[PDB]
Design a protein around this ligand. Structure first.
Ligand SMILES: CC(=O)N[C@@H]1[C@@H](O)[C@H](O[C@@H]2O[C@H](CO)[C@@H](O[C@@H]3O[C@H](CO)[C@@H](O)[C@H](O)[C@H]3NC(C)=O)[C@H](O)[C@H]2NC(C)=O)[C@@H](CO)O[C@H]1O
Length: 376
């Protein structure tokens, strides 16, 4: 199994103990590290942060401490939107400009592959023809990577993609059978399945449907989404399950109504380190759980929630990560990906569960290991 760990290049700006840079990563925990995010200018890949070159070197230097580790660079993300991708895929000239720039960029800075994170082809302003043009981009990039590997006598650069977990976005965005032939791995974003945008409480990454969910609401769980990909053309071995190391917050419209589906008024307050209303990192959640919160196990969905007065949290913990790791192995998927390693309790100071409790849970559950001693 693979354990793919996203690192974000804005985590460095979090105050105090929240600040996270590549040297904070334990190089032995994951099999792959993905750097989020690169950008695009004139149809060529580019940096986005003033010190990305510094962080790239620290990131890829981690491989000097773990000879099995591979790294990838992710391009796009939510805030990046779709317009640059649409323009870039619109013509063969623009796709060639981009692919050529990626090969040079990844080889220059020491990456082993590119993770495409277009959110999403066919949606958020992207026109309908981008569903097929995304397939064409991926096909041409895989082919260019295969040729560069042979021409440079190096292992081939990987091409992966982070893909939607919402059924409407999946249907609008991806030609799953053909896309699956050319991608090395498919990182399915099985999180953000509920959130304050819906006007009621729900879990971020429930494994199973809630018993009274009907219609499209019954799609909003890891089981349905992973099996949708699997049964519409993607090989299980290429499918990677998304694991969030954060939770979503809500303000309850009525504190006594604090179950799944309780009505809500909006996002919960920003955390002191992540400073974005609507979510908390796992280490921030641990502080919340020590501040008087009530913890509840959502038994049907195999995830926890918690609440305190008018604040409600749907999240993941060691137990839910363990249950879902067991599940993905039984279903023969390729492994797990984590959004994001800088949201774990990387210092060990917040949760009293050791360093990197959630990521370590998956490392153990998936049997990640590179140090063999040849004796008891
Ligand atoms: C408004 C909203 O919640 N939209 C959801 C998108 O966030 C999500 O996109 C992917 O998931 C993660 C986690 O949500 C995204 O991380 C966000 O990245 C932006 C920069 O682009 C940063 O400003 C946010 O702080 C950060 N949020 C968190 C909790 O870390 C990430 O960009 C996207 N890529 C990956 C691999 O996860 C999509 C997933 O389908 O759902 C929307 O509902």
């Amino acid at each position: 199994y693979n354990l793919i760990c996203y690192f974000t290049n804005w985590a460095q700006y979090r105050p105090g103990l929240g600040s996270f840079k590549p040297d904070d990563i334990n190089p032995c925990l994951c099999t792959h590290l993905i750097y989020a995010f690169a950008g695009m200018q004139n149809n060529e890949i580019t940096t986005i942060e003033w010190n990305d070159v510094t962080l790239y070197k620290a990131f890829n230097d981690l491989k000097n401490r773990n000879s099995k580790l591979k790294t990838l660079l992710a391009i796009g993300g939510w805030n990046f939107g779709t317009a640059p991708f649409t323009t870039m895929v619109s013509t063969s000239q623009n796709r060639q400009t981009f692919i050529t720039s990626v090969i040079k960029f990844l080889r220059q800075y020491g990456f082993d592959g590119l993770d495409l994170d277009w959110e999403y082809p066919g949606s958020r302003g992207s026109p309908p023809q981008d569903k097929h043009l995304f397939t064409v981009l991926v096909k041409e990039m895989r082919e260019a990577f295969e040729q560069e590997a042979i021409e440079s006598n190096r292992p081939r650069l990987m091409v992966t993609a982070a893909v939607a977990g919402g059924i409407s976005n999946i249907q609008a965005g991806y030609e799953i059978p053909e896309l699956s032939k050319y991608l090395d791995f498919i990182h399915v974003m099985t999180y953000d399945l509920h959130g304050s945008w819906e006007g009621y409480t729900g879990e971020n990454s429930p494994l199973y449907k809630y018993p009274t969910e009907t219609g499209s609401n019954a799609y909003l769980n890891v089981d349905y989404v992973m099996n949708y990909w699997k049964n519409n053309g993607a090989p299980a071995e290429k499918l990677i399950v998304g694991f969030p190391e954060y939770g979503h917050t809500f303000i309850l419209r009525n504190p006594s109504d604090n179950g799944i589906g309780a009505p809500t008024s909006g996002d919960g307050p920003a955390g002191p380190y992540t400073r974005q209303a609507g979510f908390w990192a796992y280490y921030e959640i641990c502080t919340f759980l020590r501040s008087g919160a009530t913890e509840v196990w959502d038994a049907s969905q195999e995830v926890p929630y918690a609440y305190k007065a008018n604040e409600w949290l749907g999240y993941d913990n060691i137990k839910s990560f363990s249950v879902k790791a067991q599940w993905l192995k039984q279903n023969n998927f390729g492994g797990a990906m984590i959004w994001a390693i800088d949201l774990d309790d990387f210092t060990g100071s917040f949760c009293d569960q050791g360093k990197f409790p959630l990521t370590s849970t998956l490392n153990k559950a998936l049997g990640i290991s590179t140090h063999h001693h040849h004796h008891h």
